[PDB]
Design a protein around this ligand. Structure first.
Ligand SMILES: [Zn+2]
Lengths: 21, 30, 30, 21, 30, 21
């Protein structure tokens, strides 16, 4: 999830846009 | 774009800029 | 509320929201 | 103190309110 | 002044306050 | 540089003012 994809690992722009509405 | 580990309020701020008008869900589960 | 280690300007911001009208003393001694 | 209670260890809401006026 | 390791947006904020009207160049190379 | 002086090591006020214009 949000903390394992973007804080535990290095995300990107579109992995972060996945958590939008 | 950033090449890093986004954590805490940094992580919520990134989610604030990138989504914009759509908004977001911040769910901090492990 | 947060379940974490509040450090630096995060720690001063937390102290800013939670105290409000009372204000705070930030004294960073080890 | 403030750095050992809330940065070295995990604080709460009312341990943080202790450092108010 | 701060006695610490300034990293990320903290590092850019420090550079924002201290330079002011001159501005700055943020170049994050390793 | 900027990341090795001020993030990898501990900088000061005037080492940070070096990166101004
Ligand atoms: Zn931070």
């Amino acid at each position: 999830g949000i903390v394992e994809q973007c804080c535990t690992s290095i995300c990107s722009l579109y992995q972060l846009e996945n958590y939008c509405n | 774009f950033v090449n890093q580990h986004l954590c805490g309020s940094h992580l919520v701020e990134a989610l604030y800029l990138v989504c914009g008008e759509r908004g977001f869900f911040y769910t901090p589960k492990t």
